[PDB]
Design brief:
The structure is cut from a larger assembly and holds chains A (398 residues), B (69 residues), C (54 residues) and D (395 residues). Chain A is built from 15 helices and 17 strands. With 398 residues, chain A is of the alpha+beta class. Chain A has 3 domains: 167 residues, 2-Layer Sandwich (Nucleotidyltransferase, domain 5); 117 residues, ATPase, nucleotide binding domain (Nucleotidyltransferase, domain 5, 2-Layer Sandwich), CATH 3.30.420.40; 114 residues, Actin, Chain A, domain 4. In chain A, the strands form 4 sheets. Chain A has a 6-stranded mixed β-sheet. In chain A, helix 5 packs across helix 7 and helix 10 packs across helix 11. Chain A is globular. With 69 residues, chain B is mainly alpha-helical. Chain B is 97% helix and 0% strand. The N and C termini of chain B lie far apart (102 Å). Chain C is built from 1 helix and 2 strands. The two termini of chain C are 27 Å apart. The longest helix of chain C is centred in the N-terminal third of the chain and has 7 residues. Chain C is of the alpha+beta class and 54 residues long. Chain D has a 5-stranded mixed β-sheet, sandwiched between helices. In chain D, 46% of the residues are buried. By secondary structure, chain D is an alpha+beta fold. In chain D, 33% of the residues lie in helices and 18% in strands. Chain D folds into 2 domains: 196 residues, Nucleotidyltransferase, domain 5 (2-Layer Sandwich); 137 residues, ATPase, nucleotide binding domain (Nucleotidyltransferase, domain 5, 2-Layer Sandwich), CATH 3.30.420.40. Classes of the chains: A alpha+beta (398), B mainly alpha (69), C alpha+beta (54), D alpha+beta (395). At the C-D interface, helix 1 and strand 2 of C face strand 3, strand 5, helix 1, helix 2 and helix 12 of D.
C-alpha cells in the first residue's frame, strides 16, 4: 500500500463522522448542527451541545449545517467545525495529511461551485495539501463491493435513491425524497405530545428532544410494516384464522411500553400506532392531501428505476434490481428492508430481488464514512480524483 | 488504438477497486475475529490463574495445621 | 554507567522521519506529511529505592 | 521472552507505576511510583537538557502529563528514558551480567491514554525503537488494560475517576468506542472543594486528611455516630460531624449523567445491556469506601428502566378487586458493577484502585510469553514501516 494517512470527514445532514484512514472506527461522531451561545460562542460536539441544551440558556440556538440536499450551506461554521475536528478530536494539522470528503449524488448542477467552496475551504482556509471528493451513494455501493447498484439511503433529510451502472452515477435518475429521520422526529413529537404534557429559535429544545428520547423511541418503539398497514392487517388476520382453524389473535393489540424520562411515565401504544409513523415514509398522503402516494418511497424507487432505463431499459432494470443496497440510520428501524423488498417487487413482479445490506447497527449509520474510508486507503492515486492546490489555481483563471 | 486502451483502463480500474475493497473487508473480519479470540484467551488465562492460586490457598489452609501443632 | 552506553548495551536497525513526501505516478502536484524511511546518511539517572513504596 | 525482562510503565498526570519483571508465582502491586516530572535546562543556543533533579537551579519543572493528556511529548519520552536508564543502571549494578540475561532483550509495554494523539503515539514508537533502542513495544490502552484485569469481559464501561478529571469509556467487543469516549473535567479534587464549601474553617491539608481518613464514607459503626475523630498529617486530632458523609455527591451525579448520556448512544441494544451490566470504576479517588456503591445506586436512581412507583401503586390498587410486570422496550433494565477478581492476594491486600496496571501484568503474560507477535511491533515491523507499523498491531 501507499505510505500515507488520510483524514476522512463525512458531513451528513444530521451526523458528522470524522476519523483517520488507519482506523476502521471513527475518532468522533458529532452532530451536524451547532449551538450559538450568546459575544458569539459556537458549541461543537455531542456532549458539549447536549449539556448546553440541558442548561437551557437563552440565546442558545441550534443551527444546522447541512440542509436536506446533503450539501453544506453555512461554510464558516462548517470551517470552525472542521477546526474543532482537526484540533479537539483528530489532533493533527490539516496541512500534514491528505483529506477525503463526501458529496451526495446530485443531478449535475450544484457540484462545481461547491467544489470551489471545497477548494475555498481546503486551500484558502485550512491549507489542505490535497483532498479527494467521493460520491456518497458511489462510496456506499463501492465499499460493499459493487460498481452497478441501486442505493437507497434512508437518512434524516429524507430517502436518497440512486442508480449506479458500472461505476458511474446515473444522475438524471438520482431522486432525493424528503421523508426521513427528522420527519419521524416531528411525527413522534406531535403524536406523543398529549401524553408528555407538551402539546429556528427553540431549536435548542427541539434538537435536545430529538437527540435524547425521540431517538430512543425510534430505536426501540418504532417498527416498519413489511407490507402495507391495511394489507398487513388483512394478511395477518388471514394467517391467524388459518392457525386457529388448523389447531381447532390480533397482532396489533400488543401493548408496547415506553418509559418517558422527563415525566417518569409509561407511554402505552399498540403495535398499529408503532407501525403508523413508518407508514408516513411510504404513504405521505395519510398526514395531508398535498402529498401524493408518488411522494413516498414506494413508487419513487421505481420512478428512479425507470429514468435509469433511458440512461435496453429492461436490462438496466434487472441490473439495478439484482443489486439493491439499503443503508442509512433511519433504515435501522425494524422491518424497513422487507417493506422495500415487497414494495419494490409489487412494482416489478417479473424480476427477482437480491437485496444486500450491512447488517451491523453502527456501520449502517456511518456507511458513507466507511465508503470514504475505503476510498481513502486506495493504493493507487489514479483510482480517484485528488484535487491538489493546482486545480483551484486553474479554476481562478477566467 | 485509443478506444481499446480507454475501455481496458476503465475495466481494470473497476476490477482493481473491487478487489482491494474485498481485501479490506477481509481485513475487517480478520481484525475483529482476532480481537474476540485473544479476549477469550485472556479469559482462559484468568481461569488458569484462578485454579493455580486456589490450589495454593487450599494447601496453605490445610497446612496451617502444622503451624497450629 | 553512561546512559547512552546503558541503552546501547541493552536490547541486542533503521531510523524513520516525519517528512513531506511527494508521490509519483510523474510526480503528483501535492505533498503530504508521512513517515519516510531514512537513508544511510539520514543524561541523568534517578536513584531507585527513594520511590520504592515502604 | 524472559519474564524478568518484561517492563511495564503506567504514567499519569501525577505519578507513574513502574515494574521490571514478573514474580512468576502471583501478581504483585507495583513498587516503583515515580512522579511524572522532568527538569528542563535551557542551554544557550536554545537546546534543552533534561534532568532528574533541578540542575543548579537552572532547570524548570516540566510535568509532561496533565489530565491524562501528553502536553510535552519530548519531555515525556525523555522521562521514559530516565526511568528506563535508571532500571538499566539498577540491574547492571545488582546483577552485573544483566546485559546478557536481564537487559539483553527487554520487551516494553507502555500503557497509553485515550486522549493521546496519534502523532504522539507515533513519536513514542519512533523514540522506543530508535533512541531507547528497545526491540519490542506494546502500546496498551488504559481502558483495555482495565477490562483485561477484570475477568476479560466482552462488553463493559470504564469510569476512571482521576484527580482533576473523570474518564468515561465504553468498551464493546473488546474494542474502544472512540466516538463515545468522554471526560468530565472533574475528579477527586471536587470532593475536596465540596468539603471546602461545607467546612470553611479548615484548610487544604485538614480536608485532604479527612478525604484520606478511614472515617470518610458515602451512605447509600460510622453511620450511627454523629461526631467522629480523625488525625491530621501532623498527628493532630480533629473531630467532624456529618460532613464526613458528604462532599462526593456532585461528582457522583455528574459521572452518572455522563455515563447515561454515553451509553444511551449505543445503537446495538444487546451490546448496550451487557455494557450496563459491567460497570467498572477505577481511580485512586475510588479508594473512598462506599463511593462505588453510591455511584451504582445513583445509576440505578437515574437510569434504571423500571415501572414508576406511582403507576405500580395505582395498578396494585386496581388488582385489589396478582400483579404482572410492565415490560418496557428500554435497554437498561439491569445495572450492575462488574465482578472483581478476588483471586489476586497482593491486589486484594493493596486494593483495586490501580487494577488497570494488573491487566498489564496479565497481557504481558499473554503476549510476551507466547510466540505470536500480532500486537507488538518487532524490529522487523519497525524496519518495514516505522511508526506507521503501530496501526497494524492495535487491538
Amino acid at each position: 500500500t501507499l505510505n500515507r494517512k488520510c483524514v476522512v470527514i463525512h458531513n451528513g445532514s444530521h451526523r458528522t463522522v470524522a476519523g483517520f484512514s488507519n482506523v476502521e472506527l471513527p475518532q468522533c461522531i458529532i452532530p451536524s448542527s451547532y449551538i450559538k451561545r450568546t459575544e458569539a460562542e459556537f458549541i461543537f460536539g455531542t456532549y458539549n451541545m447536549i449539556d448546553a441544551a440541558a442548561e437551557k440558556r437563552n440565546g442558545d440556538e441550534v443551527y444546522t449545517l447541512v440542509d436536506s440536499q446533503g450539501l453544506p450551506y453555512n461554510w464558516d461554521a462548517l470551517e470552525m467545525q472542521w477546526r474543532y475536528l482537526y484540533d479537539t478530536q483528530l489532533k493533527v494539522s490539516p496541512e500534514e495529511l491528505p483529506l477525503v470528503i463526501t458529496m451526495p449524488a446530485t443531478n449535475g448542477k450544484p457540484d462545481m461551485a461547491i467544489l470551489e467552496r471545497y477548494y475555498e475551504l481546503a486551500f484558502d482556509k485550512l491549507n489542505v495539501p490535497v483532498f479527494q471528493i467521493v460520491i456518497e451513494p458511489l462510496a456506499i455501493a463501492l465499499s460493499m463491493g459493487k460498481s452497478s447498484a441501486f442505493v437507497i439511503d434512508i437518512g434524516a433529510s429524507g430517502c436518497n435513491v440512486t442508480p449506479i451502472i458500472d461505476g458511474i452515477v446515473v444522475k438524471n435518475a438520482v431522486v432525493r425524497s424528503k421523508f426521513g429521520g427528522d420527519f419521524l422526529d416531528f411525527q413522534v413529537h406531535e403524536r406523543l405530545a398529549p401524553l408528555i404534557k407538551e402539546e429556528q429559535k427553540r431549536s435548542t429544545d427541539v434538537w435536545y428532544e430529538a437527540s435524547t428520547w425521540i431517538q430512543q423511541f425510534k430505536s426501540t418503539m418504532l417498527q416498519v410494516s413489511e407490507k402495507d398497514l391495511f394489507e398487513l392487517e388483512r394478511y395477518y388476520k388471514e394467517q391467524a384464522d388459518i392457525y386457529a382453524k388448523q389447531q381447532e389473535n390480533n397482532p396489533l393489540v400488543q401493548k408496547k411500553n415506553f418509559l418517558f424520562k422527563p415525566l417518569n411515565k409509561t407511554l402505552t401504544l399498540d403495535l398499529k400506532e408503532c407501525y403508523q409513523f413508518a407508514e408516513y415514509l411510504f404513504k405521505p398522503q395519510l398526514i395531508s392531501d398535498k402529498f401524493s402516494p408518488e411522494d413516498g418511497l414506494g413508487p419513487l424507487m421505481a420512478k428512479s428505476v425507470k429514468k435509469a432505463g433511458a440512461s435496453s431499459p429492461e436490462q438496466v432494470y434487472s441490473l439495478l434490481l439484482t443489486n439493491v443496497i439499503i443503508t442509512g440510520s433511519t433504515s435501522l428501524i425494524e422491518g424497513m428492508e422487507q417493506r422495500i423488498i415487497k414494495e419494490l417487487s409489487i412494482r416489478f413482479p417479473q424480476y427477482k430481488l437480491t437485496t444486500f445490506a450491512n447488517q451491523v447497527m453502527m456501520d449502517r449509520k456511518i456507511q458513507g464514512w466507511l465508503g470514504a474510508l475505503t476510498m481513502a486507503n486506495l493504493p493507487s492515486w489514479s483510482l480517484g480524483k485528488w484535487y491538489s492546490k493546482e486545480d483551484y489555481e486553474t479554476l481562478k483563471r477566467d | 488504438e485509443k478506444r481499446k486502451k480507454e475501455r481496458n483502463l476503465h475495466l481494470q480500474k473497476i476490477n482493481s477497486i473491487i478487489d482491494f475493497i474485498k481485501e479490506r473487508q477481509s481485513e475487517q473480519w480478520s481484525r475483529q475475529e482476532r480481537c474476540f479470540q485473544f479476549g477469550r484467551l485472556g479469559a482462559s488465562l484468568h481461569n488458569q490463574m484462578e485454579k493455580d492460586e486456589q490450589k495454593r490457598i487450599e494447601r496453605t489452609a490445610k497446612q496451617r495445621l502444622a503451624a497450629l501443632k | 554507567m553512561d546512559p547512552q552506553t546503558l541503552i546501547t548495551k541493552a536490547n541486542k536497525k533503521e531510523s524513520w522521519r516525519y517528512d513531506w513526501y511527494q508521490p509519483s505516478k510523474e510526480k503528483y502536484p501535492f505533498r503530504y506529511k508521512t513517515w519516510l524511511r531514512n537513508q544511510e546518511d539520514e543524561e541523568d539517572i534517578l536513584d531507585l529505592k527513594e520511590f520504592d513504596r515502604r | 521472552f524472559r519474564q524478568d525482562s518484561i517492563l511495564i510503565i503506567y504514567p499519569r498526570s501525577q505519578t507513574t507505576l513502574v515494574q521490571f519483571g514478573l514474580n512468576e508465582e502471583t501478581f504483585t502491586v507495583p513498587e516503583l511510583e515515580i512522579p511524572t516530572q522532568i527538569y528542563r535546562t535551557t542551554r544557550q543556543d536554545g537546546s534543552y537538557t533534561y534532568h532528574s533533579t533541578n540542575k543548579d537551579n537552572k532547570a524548570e519543572l516540566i510535568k509532561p502529563i496533565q489530565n491524562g493528556e501528553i502536553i510535552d511529548i519530548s519531555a515525556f519520552t525523555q522521562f521514559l528514558r530516565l526511568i528506563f536508564v535508571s532500571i538499566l543502571s539498577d540491574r547492571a549494578n545488582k546483577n552485573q551480567d544483566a546485559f546478557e540475561a536481564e537487559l539483553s532483550n527487554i520487551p516494553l509495554l507502555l500503557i497509553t491514554h485515550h486522549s493521546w494523539s496519534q502523532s504522539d503515539l507515533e513519536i513514542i514508537t519512533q523514540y522506543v525503537f530508535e533512541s531507547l533502542e528497545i526491540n519490542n513495544l506494546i502500546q496498551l490502552p488504559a481502558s483495555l488494560a482495565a477490562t483485561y484485569s477484570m475477568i476479560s469481559l466482552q462488553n463493559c464501561c470504564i469510569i476512571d475517576v482521576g484527580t482533576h478529571h473523570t474518564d468515561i469509556i465504553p468498551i464493546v467487543d473488546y474494542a474502544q468506542l472512540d466516538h463515545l469516549v468522554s471526560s468530565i473535567p472533574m475528579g477527586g479534587q471536587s470532593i475536596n472543594d465540596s468539603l471546602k464549601k461545607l467546612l470553611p474553617q479548615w484548610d487544604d491539608d485538614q480536608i485532604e486528611s479527612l478525604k484520606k481518613s478511614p472515617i470518610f464514607e458515602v451512605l447509600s459503626k460510622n453511620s450511627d455516630l454523629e461526631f467522629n475523630t480523625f488525625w491530621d498529617e501532623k498527628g493532630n486530632e480533629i473531630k467532624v460531624g456529618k460532613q464526613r458523609f458528604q462532599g462526593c455527591n456532585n461528582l457522583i451525579k455528574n459521572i452518572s449523567n455522563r455515563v447515561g448520556l454515553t451509553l444511551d448512544n449505543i445503537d446495538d441494544i444487546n451490546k448496550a445491556k451487557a455494557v450496563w451490566e459491567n460497570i467498572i470504576i477505577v481511580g485512586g479517588t475510588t479508594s473512598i469506601s462506599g463511593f462505588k456503591e453510591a455511584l451504582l445506586g445513583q445509576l440505578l436512581k437515574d437510569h434504571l428502566i423500571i415501572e414508576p412507583e406511582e403507576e405500580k401503586s395505582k395498578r396494585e390498587e386496581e388488582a385489589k378487586s396478582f400483579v404482572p410486570t410492565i415490560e418496557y422496550v428500554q435497554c437498561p433494565t439491569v445495572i450492575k458493577l462488574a465482578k472483581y477478581p478476588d483471586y489476586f492476594p497482593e491486589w486484594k491486600k493493596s486494593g483495586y484502585s490501580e487494577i488497570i496496571f494488573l491487566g498489564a501484568q496479565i497481557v504481558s503474560k499473554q503476549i510476551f510469553t507466547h510466540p505470536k507477535d500480532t500486537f507488538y511491533i518487532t524490529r522487523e515491523k519497525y524496519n518495514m514501516k516505522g511508526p506507521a507499523a503501530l496501526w497494524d498491531v492495535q487491538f
